[PDB]
Amino acid sequence: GAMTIGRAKVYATLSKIFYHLFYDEAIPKDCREIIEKIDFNLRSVLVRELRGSVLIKDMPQSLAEVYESVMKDFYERYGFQASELHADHIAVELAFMSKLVEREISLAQQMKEEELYKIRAAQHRFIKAHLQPLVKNLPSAPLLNFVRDFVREDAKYLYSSLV
Ligand SMILES: [Cl-]
Numbered sequence: 405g406a407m408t409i410g411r412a413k414v415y416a417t418l419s420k421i422f423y424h425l426f427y428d429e430a431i432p433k434d435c436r437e438i439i440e441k442i443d444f445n446l447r448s449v450l451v452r453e454l455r456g457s458v459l460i461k462d463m464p465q466s467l468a469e470v471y472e473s474v475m476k477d478f479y480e481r482y483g484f485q486a487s488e489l490h491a492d493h494i495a496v497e498l499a500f501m502s503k504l505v506e507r508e509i510s511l512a513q514q515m516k517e518e519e520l521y522k523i524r525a526a527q528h529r530f531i532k533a534h535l536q537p538l539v540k541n542l543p544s545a546p547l548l549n550f551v552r553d554f555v556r557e558d559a560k561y562l563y564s565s566l567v
Pocket residue numbers: 447448449450
């Protein structure tokens with residue numbers, strides 16, 4: 405219903421926005437109006453470094469060295485098509501969540517209770533293990549603050565919806 409539609413929209417839109425900013429491209433009107441009220445003045449050079457292995461500063465060094473591959477294997481287990489960008493980049497992690505929520509919509513409409521539960525547990529695992537640590541370590545900026553609040557709310561929602 406409404407919740408899932410909203411979640412799909414936010415993940416897909418935020419992913420698109422970070423892709424555009426990565427490549428120093430203009431944000432299209434459709435995206436802009438969804439997300440305004442603020443800034444879209446994030447430097448492309450900053451955005452290129454919004455990666456888990458870079459932002460999570462206390463990540464054990466040995467883990468930091470294999471982290472992109474850990475991410476890549478997670479994606480492959482859910483048949484997800486990993487971009488041109490590094491696997492631990494925020495744009496890619498958001499795009500992966502977008503794909504999982506899209507699959508959640510299709511499965512809920514098909515009334516597949518078991519698969520639905522599993523896809524929601526995977527969303528929860530991914531957020532707690534990967535996406536949330538990344539977003540909590542973003543520098544301060546209005547777009548970045550928006551993303552962290554959303555992910556924080558999304559983790560709580562997924563937890564309560566699973567128990
Ligand atoms: Cl720049």
